[PDB]
Structures are given as C-alpha cells and as structure tokens.
Design an enzyme around this catalytic site. Structure first.
Site, PDB file in Angstrom:
ATOM      1  N   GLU A  83      40.703  52.674  34.573  1.00  0.00           N
ATOM      2  CA  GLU A  83      39.765  51.961  35.196  1.00  0.00           C
ATOM      3  C   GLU A  83      39.934  51.084  35.947  1.00  0.00           C
ATOM      4  O   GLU A  83      40.079  49.602  35.716  1.00  0.00           O
ATOM      5  CB  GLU A  83      39.041  51.380  33.603  1.00  0.00           C
ATOM      6  CG  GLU A  83      37.592  52.320  33.311  1.00  0.00           C
ATOM      7  CD  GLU A  83      36.604  51.467  32.772  1.00  0.00           C
ATOM      8  OE1 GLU A  83      36.893  50.384  32.344  1.00  0.00           O
ATOM      9  OE2 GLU A  83      35.364  51.840  32.838  1.00  0.00           O
ATOM     10  N   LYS A 121      27.779  49.271  26.854  1.00  0.00           N
ATOM     11  CA  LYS A 121      28.053  47.785  26.955  1.00  0.00           C
ATOM     12  C   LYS A 121      26.973  47.064  26.450  1.00  0.00           C
ATOM     13  O   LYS A 121      26.702  47.378  25.014  1.00  0.00           O
ATOM     14  CB  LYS A 121      28.322  47.635  28.720  1.00  0.00           C
ATOM     15  CG  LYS A 121      29.383  48.297  29.299  1.00  0.00           C
ATOM     16  CD  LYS A 121      29.696  47.798  30.883  1.00  0.00           C
ATOM     17  CE  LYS A 121      30.675  48.784  31.254  1.00  0.00           C
ATOM     18  NZ  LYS A 121      31.307  48.145  32.691  1.00  0.00           N
ATOM     19  N   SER A 178      32.660  53.678  38.145  1.00  0.00           N
ATOM     20  CA  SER A 178      31.490  54.497  38.968  1.00  0.00           C
ATOM     21  C   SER A 178      31.578  56.018  39.020  1.00  0.00           C
ATOM     22  O   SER A 178      31.441  56.663  39.898  1.00  0.00           O
ATOM     23  CB  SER A 178      31.624  53.660  40.374  1.00  0.00           C
ATOM     24  OG  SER A 178      31.370  52.320  40.382  1.00  0.00           O
ATOM     25  N   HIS A 209      39.073  46.897  27.205  1.00  0.00           N
ATOM     26  CA  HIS A 209      38.451  46.977  28.428  1.00  0.00           C
ATOM     27  C   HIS A 209      38.400  46.224  29.505  1.00  0.00           C
ATOM     28  O   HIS A 209      38.879  45.041  29.314  1.00  0.00           O
ATOM     29  CB  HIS A 209      36.932  47.326  28.122  1.00  0.00           C
ATOM     30  CG  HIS A 209      36.003  47.460  29.251  1.00  0.00           C
ATOM     31  ND1 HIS A 209      35.675  48.862  29.492  1.00  0.00           N
ATOM     32  CD2 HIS A 209      35.313  46.796  29.984  1.00  0.00           C
ATOM     33  CE1 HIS A 209      34.842  49.010  30.519  1.00  0.00           C
ATOM     34  NE2 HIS A 209      34.534  47.825  30.736  1.00  0.00           N
ATOM     35  N   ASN A 264      30.191  54.276  27.613  1.00  0.00           N
ATOM     36  CA  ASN A 264      30.137  52.701  27.085  1.00  0.00           C
ATOM     37  C   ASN A 264      28.827  52.360  27.430  1.00  0.00           C
ATOM     38  O   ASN A 264      28.710  51.917  28.582  1.00  0.00           O
ATOM     39  CB  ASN A 264      31.441  52.080  27.652  1.00  0.00           C
ATOM     40  CG  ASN A 264      31.604  50.659  27.533  1.00  0.00           C
ATOM     41  OD1 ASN A 264      30.860  50.000  26.729  1.00  0.00           O
ATOM     42  ND2 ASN A 264      32.291  50.032  28.157  1.00  0.00           N
ATOM     43  N   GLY A 324      31.157  49.028  38.354  1.00  0.00           N
ATOM     44  CA  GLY A 324      29.979  48.437  38.718  1.00  0.00           C
ATOM     45  C   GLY A 324      29.308  48.479  40.206  1.00  0.00           C
ATOM     46  O   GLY A 324      28.498  47.690  40.651  1.00  0.00           O
ATOM     47  N   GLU A 327      36.549  44.111  30.949  1.00  0.00           N
ATOM     48  CA  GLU A 327      35.710  42.905  30.891  1.00  0.00           C
ATOM     49  C   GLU A 327      35.976  42.096  29.663  1.00  0.00           C
ATOM     50  O   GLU A 327      36.052  40.943  29.877  1.00  0.00           O
ATOM     51  CB  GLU A 327      34.142  43.408  30.660  1.00  0.00           C
ATOM     52  CG  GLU A 327      33.270  43.862  31.869  1.00  0.00           C
ATOM     53  CD  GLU A 327      32.630  45.340  31.594  1.00  0.00           C
ATOM     54  OE1 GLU A 327      32.223  45.500  30.415  1.00  0.00           O
ATOM     55  OE2 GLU A 327      32.405  45.921  32.634  1.00  0.00           O
TER      56      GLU A 327
END
EC number: 5.3.1.1
Lengths: 247, 247
Positions: free
Chosen positions: A164, A12, A210, A94, A10, A170, A96
C-alpha cells in the site's frame, strides 16, 4: 498451487449502526464470486455488530490490536477479545498506524507474532512514502518492513501481505498495473530467498491505494497481484465489482 | 456548591463477555452510595455490550477517541460512534496513551475539544513521571498539561480532571493522603487563577494511582480529592467499597 483471490475492505473510521447495517444488507445479498475470499475491517466499536449481521461466508477483521492478551494498556484491544466476539482477522501495520500514530516496524512485527499465536489471520501492510519513492529506495523500505514481520512469524499460512503506497491512499492516484506488478514480484522474490519457496508460492500479496471499480480489472490480471485492500470504495456498492474483478 | 463524589473504573485492556458480564451483574445489584457518580471505562470492542447490560444509573466511558467524526484513520473511533451506542463519556490523555503510545499534549487538547463539542463528558488525565518528580518539576509538568486541556475547553461542566502520578500506576505504591491533597490543592488553585473562580469550585479533581479498598477512605476524606479513577481494583468486587469510600 494457486493462491485464492483475496479482497479486504477497510471501512476505517466510518459509519454508524444504521449506515453499516445498510452496507451489510447489500453485501449479504450481492452476487459474489465463489473463488474470492472476502474480509471486512470494521471499527472496534462495531466488530460484534458487524460479525452478527454479516454472512459467515464473509470474514471480519479488527483494524488494529496489541501484542499481549491483557494488561494496563488503556485504549487497546487484544486478539483474545477479537476471538471472543467471533472475528478471525486483524489488519496490522496499516499506513495510518505507522505514519499518523507512529507505530514502528518492530512493534508491528511483535503485534503480528501475537495475533498469529492466538489463531488470528493477519493482513500485514507495508509501503513506502512519496519522498522514499522519488529517491529510488522503494525496495529497501518495503524489504525492511517485511523483514521486521518475518523475524516474528513462525507460520505464514494465515498471513496476507498488503502492499500500500502511502501516497496512493486517498488521492485517486493509484500505481499503474505495471508499477504494482514490479513491487509484488520483488516482494515475492524476497520471501523466496529469505523464508522459503513454499511461502512465496502460497502467500497472497494484495495491492491497496486508490482501488476502484474503474481500475481493478487491469490490476487483478497481473501475475503477482493476488487481490486488493480497498479503502474508500469499500463503503459503496462498487466494492462488489472489485470482489468480482476476475471476469 | 459542593461537587458530586466521582468514581471512574478503568478496566483498561482486560476482560471478555463472560467475565465483564459477571462484573456488571455484581454492580447492578450492589448497594451504591446515591451521592456518588459512577462511570465504567470499557474496552472499545465491548462498549455496546457494556452500555446495554449496565444499569442506566451507571455511566459508560470509552478509553480513548480521535479528534474528528470520520475519516481515513484506521484503528480509531470518534465521539460520533461512542454517542451512537449510547455512552456519554470518554477518557482522554491517560498516562498509557501519553507514554506508551506517544500522544502529545496538543493532540490530547484537540481530542478534548472535539469530544466536548459532540456532547460527551471527558475525564482528562494529567500527571508527572518519576524523573520529573525527583527533578522538582511536578508542578511545571501538570500545569503544562492542564493548560493544553483548558485552552480547548469551552464548557467545564462536562469535564473531570484525573491526576495520576505515572510512578503510582501499577507500582502498588500510592501517594500519602497529604501528598495527594498537596497536588489537587495546587491544581484547583491553578484553575482559580487561569480560568475562573466558579470553575475551580465546581470542577471535580479525582485521584488515580494504586487506589484500593484499603486506602480509599483516607484519600477521599481530603478536602480537594473529589473521587477516584480506579485501575486494577475496578475489575474486582472491591470496586464497590471504593464507590462507597465516603463512609
């Protein structure tokens, strides 16, 4: 019988034509494991470009889409458009999207049903927040998320679940192998008893949060980890080492 | 001193390469009024294609963007990417982003400042819902929305205000010319007093909401309507007659 190892990258909101072009040239020339299914999730404005340049043996995924083919929905794209440029996957739900942009469990269930009805593969993401994990309610939250998806899926053959942890994204702090096994195991056991035994045996449940070349061999040798959703490491040549995590 | 007449076409979530290609070829060979600035908002997936095929006289706009150049924001595109494919505009704060997708005035303000900083022109959209108009607070709401935009504009030369009454979008029902004039007059008056005189008189304030070929001549001949943001008619060949509304 066995599920095929699956590794999605991904990208992003990163890249331009020049920098994604170099990244693609690197993948196109890499020694990739033949028994690994690879998909790259490019930003919408570069999907056509990514699909042209990438070798056909590598999948291309949109990073989101909407739940009707067309209409007055400024800023959105539909599966119709994704298919039109020749891509075959879409990442939906996702962390986000859910947490920064406020997409609900039910909206994602809807987006997924549509993506499937139009003939896309779907990487449906689920995962709990840190306050949810510290409280003990990890299972209740991921089950709730999967359930909004299941109520809408007619056919699971083209679905990959991605677990996830929102807080692993991150931060360099991934789940220990044992912690990740714990959730996929439970998740597979949910599918067994709420859909069918076949969907449990044949659906890939991949881990994200990660993932790096350093930590992936250990994660991949867990019985119910079927691959990775890779974020930051997907923009670097160590993405190749992760695709080859199984040797 | 006068302002160039401005007509943006918002294709929203419609089209594929074949049908957008036909439309673009229609525009490329159309007789357009030389003193009209035209811009077409394409879906993100087709921005590159649109910029390549459309004559350079015709501008291209993204339908949305995020507030930073890169980062962990799955599904978003930045102005750095829009510029990278040669487009020069972005539509921000559309009614559909605001009310279907939940974008606040503060997020739209931050988006505006970043887009302006990276050198894009901006079509910022403001407007009231039907409950707000019947409650008597049309002016309260549009000024509130305009203020969130103005607090983040350093340079107004590259900004176009689009007033769209949300109850006018896709209802087949437009404001009368007198009602539309009434709001743009108020808005230009607001800019006069909270920013500067020069800005008020140079800033284009365009009308969006159920604009067709049948009603554009009367609308455009009002003193403070400087053009249009066209929705569904931007996909038809009658888009050409709206571009030419001023004779």
């Amino acid at each position: 019988a066995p599920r095929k190892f699956f590794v999605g990258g991904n990208w992003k909101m990163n890249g331009d034509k020049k920098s994604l072009g170099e990244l693609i040239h690197t993948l196109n020339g890499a020694k990739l494991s033949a028994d690994t299914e690879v998909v790259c999730g490019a930003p919408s404005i570069y999907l056509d470009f990514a699909r042209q340049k990438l070798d056909a043996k590598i999948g291309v995924a949109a990073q989101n889409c909407y739940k009707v083919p067309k209409g007055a929905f400024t800023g959105e794209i539909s599966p119709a458009m994704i298919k039109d440029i020749g891509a075959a996957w879409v990442i939906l739900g996702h962390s986000e999207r859910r947490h920064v942009f406020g997409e609900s469990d039910e909206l994602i269930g809807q987006k997924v049903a549509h993506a499937l009805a139009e003939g896309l593969g779907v990487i449906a993401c689920i995962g709990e927040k840190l306050d949810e994990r510290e409280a003990g309610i990890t299972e209740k939250v991921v089950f709730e998320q999967t359930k909004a998806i299941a109520d809408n899926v007619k056919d699971w053959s083209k679905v990959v679940l991605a677990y996830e942890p929102v807080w692993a994204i991150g931060t360099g702090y991934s789940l220990t192998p044992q912690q990740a096994q714990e959730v996929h195991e439970k998740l597979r056991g949910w599918l067994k008893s709420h859909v069918s035994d076949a969907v449990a045996q044949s659906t890939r449940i991949i881990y994200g949060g990660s993932v790096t070349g350093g930590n992936c061999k250990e994660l991949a040798s867990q019985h119910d980890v079927d691959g990775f959703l890779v974020g930051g490491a997907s923009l670097k040549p160590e993405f190749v080492d992760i695709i080859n995590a199984k040797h």
